[PDB]
Amino acid sequence: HHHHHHMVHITLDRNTANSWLIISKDRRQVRMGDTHQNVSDNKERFSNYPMVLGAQRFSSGKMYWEVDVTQKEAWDLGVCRDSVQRKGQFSLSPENGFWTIWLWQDSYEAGTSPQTTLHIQVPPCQIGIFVDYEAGVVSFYNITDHGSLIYTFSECVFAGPLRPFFNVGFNYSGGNAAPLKLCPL
Numbered sequence: 001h002h003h004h005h006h007m008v009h010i011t012l013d014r015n016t017a018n019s020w021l022i023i024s025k026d027r028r029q030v031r032m033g034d035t036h037q038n039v040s041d042n043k044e045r046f047s048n049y050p051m052v053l054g055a056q057r058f059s060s061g062k063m064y065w066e067v068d069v070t071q072k073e074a075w076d077l078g079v080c081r082d083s084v085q086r087k088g089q090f091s092l093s094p095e096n097g098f099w100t101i102w103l104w105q106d107s108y109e110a111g112t113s114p115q116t117t118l119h120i121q122v123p124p125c126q127i128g129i130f131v132d133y134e135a136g137v138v139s140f141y142n143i144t145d146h147g148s149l150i151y152t153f154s155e156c157v158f159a160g161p162l163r164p165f166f167n168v169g170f171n172y173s174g175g176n177a178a179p180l181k182l183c184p185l
């Protein structure tokens with residue numbers, strides 16, 4: 001892929017974070033805390049899952065960013081509508097406003113409904129995410145494997161501004177404490 005030149009600087013929006021997340025001073029890293037992080041509740045926060053949005057909103061053009069997932073057992077990454085549901089239980093699907101992939105129990109899957117098995121030969125340590133708003137495309141790239149394609153959502157119906165989307169996952173096992181990190185340009 002030759003998408004690197006649409007690189008955008010993403011930062012995390014603290015106000016949207018689940019109340020157990022810890023976001024670094026530079027707003028470029030997030031991890032699961034071992035308790036409530038002593039913040040007030042608000043209508044933006046994801047209540048049920050360890051999710052957070054990027055601050056940036058995109059309604060046109062081409063955008064690219066990279067995320068470090070080193071040594072995590074579980075995570076979701078992609079984009080979502082600015083208007084997605086924050087409270088209660090929901091599935092990651094395009095019908096609900098999400099264009100995502102994930103790692104869960106040693107399998108990588110795309111968030112179609114129902115979900116799609118991904119065929120990854122080299123477990124990724126960094127993921128590239130490309131959005132073409134006008135074309136209706138979200139693509140995922142394996143930066144560890146020379147940028148190989150992971151998955152393309154095409155014919156996307158965004159139906160609103162898009163935000164970068166992250167889920168650090170639960171840490172029931174004690175093996176998933178590591179952060180998601182936004183990688184330097």
Ligand SMILES: CC(C)N1CCN(C(=O)c2cccs2)CC1
Nearest residue numbers: 074075076091092102103104169
């Ligand atoms: C890895 C983990 C943090 N993900 C939580 C959110 N998630 C879903 O909502 C779905 C699962 C099956 C259909 S949708 C995908 C898995």
